[PDB]
Amino acid sequence: ETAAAKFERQHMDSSSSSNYCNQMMKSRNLTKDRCKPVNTFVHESLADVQAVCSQKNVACKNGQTNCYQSYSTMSITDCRETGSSKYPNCAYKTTQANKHIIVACEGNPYVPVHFDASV
Known part of the structure; x- marks a missing residue:
């Protein structure tokens, strides 16, 4: 599996619910x-997300310079592990939002390889 x-x-x-x-x-x-x-998770098309690699260049959280912020907000779902969550039964909190995404891009073709943040 590639990056x-x-x-x-x-x-x-x-391709939302409380158990998503x-x-x-x-x-x-x-x-x-x-x-x-x-x-x-990003609900936009792959083409739209891959297009972010040609958008606003910004610094990555780790200090690298290959991060890009989307010009438009995107439909996303943030998943956060609850306190009562214990492996192997991992429990998560589902939260839908519309925010700009920041991804790190690499390679040829230059594509997203890391989800850095949502703003």
Whole structure:
């Protein structure tokens, strides 16, 4: 699995409910080795998200310079692990929102490889 493929698996859902995160985090294998604390799914088309790599260049949280912020807000779902959540039964809080996304891009083709933040 490539870095680009991994990004699509972990963050893309172009296809809501209170149990969305509980179902999605498991189906996308984000709770295999451990309960991933937080994760975000983007409901926009792959083309629209891949297009962010040519948008607003901004600094990455880690200090690298290959991050890009979307010019338009995007429909996203933030997943956050609850306190009562215990592996292997990872429980998540599903929250829908419309915000600008920031992703790190790499390669040729230059595509998203890391979801940095939502603003």
